[PDB]
Design a binder for this molecule. Sequence first.
Ligand SMILES: CC1(C)Oc2ncnc(N)c2N=C1c1ccc([C@H]2CC[C@H](CC(=O)O)CC2)cc1
Ligand SMILES: CC1(C)Oc2ncnc(N)c2N=C1c1ccc([C@H]2CC[C@H](CC(=O)O)CC2)cc1
Lengths: 406, 406
Amino acid sequence: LRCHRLQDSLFSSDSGFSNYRGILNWCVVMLILSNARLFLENLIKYGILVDPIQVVSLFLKDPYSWPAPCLVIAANVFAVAAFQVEKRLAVGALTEQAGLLLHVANLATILCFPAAVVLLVESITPVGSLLALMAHTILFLKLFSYRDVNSWCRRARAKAASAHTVSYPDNLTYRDLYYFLFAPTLCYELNFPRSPRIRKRFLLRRILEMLFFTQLQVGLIQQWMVPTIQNSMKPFKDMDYSRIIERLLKLAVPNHLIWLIFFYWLFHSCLNAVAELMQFGDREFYRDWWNSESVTYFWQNWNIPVHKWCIRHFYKPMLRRGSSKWMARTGVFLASAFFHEYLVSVPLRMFRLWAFTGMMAQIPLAWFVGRFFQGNYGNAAVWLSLIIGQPIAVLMYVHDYYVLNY
Amino acid sequence: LRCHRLQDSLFSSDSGFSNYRGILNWCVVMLILSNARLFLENLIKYGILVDPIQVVSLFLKDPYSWPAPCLVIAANVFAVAAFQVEKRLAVGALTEQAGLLLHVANLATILCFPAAVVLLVESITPVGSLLALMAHTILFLKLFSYRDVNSWCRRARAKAASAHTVSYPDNLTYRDLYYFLFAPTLCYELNFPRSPRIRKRFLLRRILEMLFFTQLQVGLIQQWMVPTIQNSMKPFKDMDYSRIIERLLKLAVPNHLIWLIFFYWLFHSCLNAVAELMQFGDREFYRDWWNSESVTYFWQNWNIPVHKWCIRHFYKPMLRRGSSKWMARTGVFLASAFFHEYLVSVPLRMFRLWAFTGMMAQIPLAWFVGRFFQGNYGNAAVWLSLIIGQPIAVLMYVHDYYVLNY
Ligand SMILES: CC1(C)Oc2ncnc(N)c2N=C1c1ccc([C@H]2CC[C@H](CC(=O)O)CC2)cc1
Ligand SMILES: CC1(C)Oc2ncnc(N)c2N=C1c1ccc([C@H]2CC[C@H](CC(=O)O)CC2)cc1
């Protein structure tokens, strides 16, 4: 017969192969070969400690020497307040308008309370402040979704009244609320899927991944970025465009590797360990944002929880009350910009309005990268826009904070 | 409806996603970001030269001061000798037994001639010697396939005699032979496929890839391996197991990166530029050997030309004359081991019999990695066996040559 068809090479720009589940394993085996000795040593060095019980005792002993773990616990009063308004509204008291009013007040409190606490307390640490604010914004989004879902189901029951799974009002229990609050999802939904069992092997591999990547990220920072920042210490507040760009083009690639490591550390190790502990079963926190040949396709697959929340609690609910689809999309982007700014600035007390500018510039950049570049070159443009792009904003914040405190 | 299915994360060991055509583009864009400045500078520095015409004149002026380009040209007498025996055999003279005899003599000459020339001439360079021997072994394999194919087609015509495409005897022209000799394939076949046209853009990108990766590989060698070899210079001939392993475990990873760079440089840039110049259309010189969860699956997809030659001129032709399938497979491995040894040793005049040992150890290693490791862990085992594995043999050869001549 024949032995020579007419085909193309697999790496060729037009073959359509896309089966590279051996390049990720190559990255894994090379990372292990390079850092396994140090990881084993550091694990034996920092595993002999009894951190959890000693630290929780040292904290409960003095509930004023750690204000961030105090705010994390104080958010429970907002959780319980939302639950109480919801239960009263389900029984019948506090008619719909009053219920919406109370929930708006409670959510505005969830936001503007820890901002004031970390802006009017000087004994608090930036990392602790950031974790407090992140717990509170996650609680805010979760409670917004809780309110929306219970509103929908209650109005559905009321409409039906004029004529194993769980119906509307029988879900309002504290066990339900506190399984939802700790679940790896910002989208509330009755009858969350479940997994069969715990899979100890899986949880062990995930915790190993968390520890290994923590060590890797600390090494990256303390051996590639701190030395580079200390090479020429001048805050980005005053430097002109030339100098700020010349500094960022040297600080960008280590920043990008830290970003990728942190993506894998959170969105696949932390969330998967959580969702495995308490069987959650969805376990789809990202999609192929890496082979994303457009900016608008990157944001749809990066950080799936926040994105599906944005969709079905801010974009579709605003298209229902038809509001100029373009305007509602701009509103989605505006809310996300505000939240990125509020997360990065307030812990550092800075108000340069930079992460806001990045998230807003994501619109013209989307138009640009869509109209000009296409295919694999569009993908390379998206990667370039992630190397400098938006993460450089958080880099600028942390750098100008480190250059003024050490 | 629902918004939470029951799925798994894409990186999860059991999701079956395998669509990472964004990690290769990440590697590409990072390589460019890291080396584009130097590449542009070096290209402007070494593009002003007039290398081809000046060097070919300097050579034709003195056909004894460059014996490797003399052997490369002298192999044409073997090409023409095979063609002449074939044409006489097609017309009718030199009956089949005599024709097989003459071809065996001509092939044994193709092999044992340049070995003697590079072993009895001291004015020859190791790289030039290697390219001469590689041209001659490629010519040997191509002529073996030429003989086999014409034998098959001639016997087919003879059998049929007792009863646009190209028939058997009308292909024997010099244009056919010399399009086959320069084609990116060791497998002869009448009516090779063709491509529509030249695609100047494609050829330009391929030449750019060749130049960029040449610069990258030179940088790798001269800044990661020469310094490491010069850290402790002792040839592998005498050192015990402990010291040789301790040296190779420091020299292995740079060697592996050079290996990957050279794979992409040859099997996708050089061969594709060739097959694009002279429209060849097959352009399938490798397959997904990277996501190969077994050793026996790696060799079936690494270096497709040599492998399909091995199959349909040494394995199936030996199963036809049924010879204990296991024995024929061992014979395939033995021939490949001999050719790797003959390619790496003779240019360096060494005879340590190391690449032979590697290619032979590929059998028990195949059994091992197949029986023990499975799935993504089998793939990680294959990657580990490529980091130390067989390429360490060529590394040992080149190192023991460099440690005794500089
Ligand atoms: C910018 C925003 C909010 O912030 C994110 N913050 C963190 N993680 C994410 N994943 C984010 N995603 C986001 C986001 C959300 C929705 C959209 C869609 C795109 C599609 C069009 C319709 C259309 O024109 O086809 C409707 C609106 C785009 C971006
Ligand atoms: C080792 C050898 C010759 O050297 C190579 N040298 C360079 N590049 C390659 N690509 C090579 N490939 C090779 C080679 C060829 C054929 C085989 C097959 C495997 C399959 C079994 C049947 C079975 O047991 O399923 C039949 C024999 C294996 C390896």
